[PDB]
């Protein structure tokens, strides 16, 4: 559900 830009 939540997107997070890869580190």
């Amino acid at each position: 559900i939540v997107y997070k830009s890869p580190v």
Partner: antibody
Amino acid sequence: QVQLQQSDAELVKPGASVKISCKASGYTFTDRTIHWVKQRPEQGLEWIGYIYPGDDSTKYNDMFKAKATLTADKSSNTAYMQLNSLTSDDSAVYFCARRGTMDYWGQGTSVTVSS
Amino acid sequence: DVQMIQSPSSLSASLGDIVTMTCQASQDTSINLNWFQQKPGKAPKLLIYGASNLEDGVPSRFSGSRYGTDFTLTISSLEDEDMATYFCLQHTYLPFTFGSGTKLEIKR
């Protein structure tokens, strides 16, 4: 210069398939996601999904999980979108874009589905 | 889906004017919201990310604000080069969604 260069416009017969390319340059290809977007003149943009070339993970909009396959080729720095079982509804301009924030966009690829 | 509801659908203003447009989120959730400019036949260009942060190389004639779940794009000192369609992007929850767009016409 970050640049995303997409393949030419394509004419495809209904029921057939099309593979669209997005060649990235100006940054390290395996450090940013690539997202794909559909644009039709009367519908307004729809998000298709994304690939992270780093680990080749993918996510899809449910509307497109059956029709779209996102792949990547780190040696040529190219992302691909395969669209299957094409119908007149699939006629549109397709964009690739860098990152979830979409800070750079390709120029778009116009697909015509027609016999 | 957390959809973005955009209005107005079009806008007609004079050179030098201040113009605004809004996207309202379809759920009471915190989201990261971007604004884009797209000219006919061209690729979108990012203006504003995170509701109010100006993308590098974009004029500060462009600005964004957030009031609750209402997001506003403002354009001051309107110029011919600003004639375009503008849309927002919700990029927190999958699937990402876009507002339906605001087409900006210049009076003469």
